[PDB]
Amino acid sequence: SGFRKMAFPSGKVEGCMVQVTCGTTTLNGLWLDDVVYCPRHVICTSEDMLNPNYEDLLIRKSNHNFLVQAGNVQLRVIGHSMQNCVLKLKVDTANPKTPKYKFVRIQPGQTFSVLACYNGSPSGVYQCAMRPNFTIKGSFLNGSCGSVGFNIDYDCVSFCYMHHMELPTGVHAGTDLEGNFYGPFVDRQTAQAAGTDTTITVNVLAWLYAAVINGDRWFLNRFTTTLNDFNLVAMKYNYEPLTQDHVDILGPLSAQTGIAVLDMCASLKELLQNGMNGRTILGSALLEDEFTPFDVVRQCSGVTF
Amino acid sequence: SGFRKMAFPSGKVEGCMVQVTCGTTTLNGLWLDDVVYCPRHVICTSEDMLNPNYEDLLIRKSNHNFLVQAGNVQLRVIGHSMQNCVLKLKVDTANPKTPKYKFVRIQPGQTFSVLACYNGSPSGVYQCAMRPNFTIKGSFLNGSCGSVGFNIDYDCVSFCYMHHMELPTGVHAGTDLEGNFYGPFVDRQTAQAAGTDTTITVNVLAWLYAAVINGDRWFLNRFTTTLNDFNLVAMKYNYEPLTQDHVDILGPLSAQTGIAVLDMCASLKELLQNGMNGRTILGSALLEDEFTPFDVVRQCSGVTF
Ligand SMILES: N#CC1(CS(=O)(=O)N2Cc3ccc(Cl)cc3[C@H](C(=O)Nc3cncc4ccccc34)C2)CC1
Ligand SMILES: N#CC1(CS(=O)(=O)N2Cc3ccc(Cl)cc3[C@H](C(=O)Nc3cncc4ccccc34)C2)CC1
Numbered sequence: 248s249g250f251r252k253m254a255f256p257s258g259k260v261e262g263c264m265v266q267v268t269c270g271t272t273t274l275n276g277l278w279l280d281d282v283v284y285c286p287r288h289v290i291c292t293s294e295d296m297l298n299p300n301y302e303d304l305l306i307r308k309s310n311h312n313f314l315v316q317a318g319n320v321q322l323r324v325i326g327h328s329m330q331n332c333v334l335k336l337k338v339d340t341a342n343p344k345t346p347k348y349k350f351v352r353i354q355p356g357q358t359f360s361v362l363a364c365y366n367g368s369p370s371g372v373y374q375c376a377m378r379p380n381f382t383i384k385g386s387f388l389n390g391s392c393g394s395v396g397f398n399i400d401y402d403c404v405s406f407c408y409m410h411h412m413e414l415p416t417g418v419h420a421g422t423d424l425e426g427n428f429y430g431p432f433v434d435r436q437t438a439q440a441a442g443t444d445t446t447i448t449v450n451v452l453a454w455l456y457a458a459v460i461n462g463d464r465w466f467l468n469r470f471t472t473t474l475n476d477f478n479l480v481a482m483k484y485n486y487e488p489l490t491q492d493h494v495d496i497l498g499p500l501s502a503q504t505g506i507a508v509l510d511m512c513a514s515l516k517e518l519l520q521n522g523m524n525g526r527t528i529l530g531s532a533l534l535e536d537e538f539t540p541f542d543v544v545r546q547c548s549g550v551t552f
Numbered sequence: 553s554g555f556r557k558m559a560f561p562s563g564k565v566e567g568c569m570v571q572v573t574c575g576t577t578t579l580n581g582l583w584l585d586d587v588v589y590c591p592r593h594v595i596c597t598s599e600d601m602l603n604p605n606y607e608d609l610l611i612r613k614s615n616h617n618f619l620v621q622a623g624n625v626q627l628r629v630i631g632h633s634m635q636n637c638v639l640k641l642k643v644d645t646a647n648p649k650t651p652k653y654k655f656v657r658i659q660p661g662q663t664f665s666v667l668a669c670y671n672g673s674p675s676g677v678y679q680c681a682m683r684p685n686f687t688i689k690g691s692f693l694n695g696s697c698g699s700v701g702f703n704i705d706y707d708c709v710s711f712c713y714m715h716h717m718e719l720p721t722g723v724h725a726g727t728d729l730e731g732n733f734y735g736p737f738v739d740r741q742t743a744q745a746a747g748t749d750t751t752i753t754v755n756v757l758a759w760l761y762a763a764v765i766n767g768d769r770w771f772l773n774r775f776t777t778t779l780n781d782f783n784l785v786a787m788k789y790n791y792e793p794l795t796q797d798h799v800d801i802l803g804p805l806s807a808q809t810g811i812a813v814l815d816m817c818a819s820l821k822e823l824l825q826n827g828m829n830g831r832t833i834l835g836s837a838l839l840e841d842e843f844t845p846f847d848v849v850r851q852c853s854g855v856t857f
């Protein structure tokens with residue numbers, strides 16, 4: 248029993264975190280094999296950020312201008328290149344702690360673990376989701392740039408996010424490990440804002456199934472709905488549309504609890520129109536949307552890494 | 553900016569998890585130096601658990617009855633002894649991945665990270681607190697016994713909890729790393745139930761100071777209160793008494809925000825009376841009590857917004 252916001256064990260990622268310094272700027276790098284990956288804005292001053300020309304700033308740099316520190320050991324930079332908004336530093340030593348890994352680009356609604364780092368040293372681990380507006384609600388202070396997001400599929404670390412910036416609303420933006428931003432953001436000090444956000448419907452449904460598995464059934468009712476009628480109600484409350492793909496993905500949980508997906512949709516409709524009436528679900532007074540159907544199955548079955 | 557339920561990076565603990573087998577029973581062990589620590593109920597059958605005589609069950613066991621597996625390597629048990637409710641197995645190999653560590657006994661209200669394991673393999677990491685009734689609200693399935701709770705302040709891992717059992721209400725009970733249970737609980741399947749749980753008042757106050765640091769003041773008011781009048785109100789809402797020790801501990805957060813502890817107590821009294829009226833504090837519609845004053849200082853910025 249129990250249902251907690253759970254992150255993947257971070258050990259395989261901790262062994263890759265390094266400190267990258269370029270002049271007065273210090274941030275975090277990811278050391279895999281003989282390459283260190285970090286945000287390209289490490290080569291900028293506060294002044295450059297206003298309107299940076301990254302190739303022009305990079306051409307003026309030599310290998311010895313980048314200081315890479317792994318623990319208390321200094322690594323030697325023997326090459327440098329740029330791919331989108333990520334700087335790739337070739338080093339003389341391959342990381343002996345390099346795990347089995349892949350670079351993956353995730354979709355909004357997908358969750359991942361974040362290993363927050365400062366000066367190449369991991370400080371904490373938490374779970375979060377890529378919001379429909381492409382931002383993440385992280386917890387990051389100055390110096391956290393270069394911190395990474397990941398998932399573990401069997402024994403392989405899937406790196407999906409690298410941290411670059413904080414928006415005025417306190418939410419966060421970054422790139423995949425190939426340097427492509429999630430969302431309409433740019434790595435420049437200029438006016439940028441998160442768009443209006445929506446609730447991840449398939450995730451709230453998965454979390455309602457996790458509550459049923461744990462004994463919270465007060466919100467169940469005898470009613471059902473059509474997929475079209477549920478989507479008209481979802482549009483009214485700023486919830487993402489539910490597709491037939493989402494219904495198929497919820498199939499295993501629907502069979503385990505004996506509650507059809509459209510039967511659980513009728514419960515969600517009543518919760519939206521009437522509220523919780525002083526009651527809670529899994530210790531929460533809000534409808535939680537940062538657990539995917541896979542996360543629910545994983546936590547209710549004990550999958551190890 | 554941001555405020556998340558954050559766990560310590562688990563890497564130092566993942567490198568200590570092993571599988572312990574005794575007959576038909578399999579659970580997790582913690583391998584530090586040349587000793588494996590695990591719950592003593594690993595020597596019991598389901599039948600033994602009603603009224604076990606551990607000394608009598610243990611005297612019938614030899615070193616070669618315990619199978620310890622670290623990764624895909626088998627360890628050799630060369631000694632065994634019992635200390636309170638923990639079994640200590642001496643092995644022929646010292647753990648090369650043993651971190652700098654301490655065994656610490658915590659008080660109710662204190663938080664820690666849990667590395668949930670099955671068959672000696674880590675599955676997830678989450679944050680939780682020792683409830684005032686000495687239980688923890690974890691997320692554990694059968695096979696999770698022997699999973700550990702820890703803090704990693706600075707570079708030293710302080711082990712504070714080892715998982716032993718689930719109570720009928722779905723909550724969890726366990727021991728410190730010296731085998732002493734937290735609470736009036738026994739490693740015996742007897743009529744046992746958690747006492748009435750209460751809210752950790754000093755933690756809710758710390759979390760209100762975090763909300764102020766992150767730029768929110770909607771809940772503050774022009775009032776103050778005496779310590780005694782606050783306690784008479786709080787206990788009617790099932791909140792733990794706030795002691796002078798707790799007031800002293802909140803001193804640093806009070807000086808940073810400029811809000812006196814008894815002024816913050818007045819806001820909490822009003823929030824308990826009025827509810828939130830459709831508003832949230834740090835993304836929550838309930839008052840959060842699983843962040844200590846020390847966790848808030850560790851995560852939040854030193855500059856108030
Ligand atoms: N809005 C905003 C803020 C950011 S900033 O203006 O100081 N800043 C401009 C900027 C522009 C583009 C890029 Cl790619 C990076 C960056 C940097 C960036 O975001 N860094 C950070 C990242 N994370 C968490 C931070 C917390 C605190 C201060 C910086 C933080 C620096 C004030 C929060
Ligand atoms: N009530 C209850 C339950 C546990 S039990 O009755 O099967 N059980 C009695 C018992 C008594 C004392 C001691 Cl020391 C250990 C133990 C064991 C124990 O708690 N194991 C577990 C531990 N954690 C999480 C579990 C989840 C699911 C099943 C086992 C779980 C076995 C059914 C939840």
Ligand SMILES: [Cl-]
Binds near residue numbers: 657659662
């Ligand atoms: Cl303590």
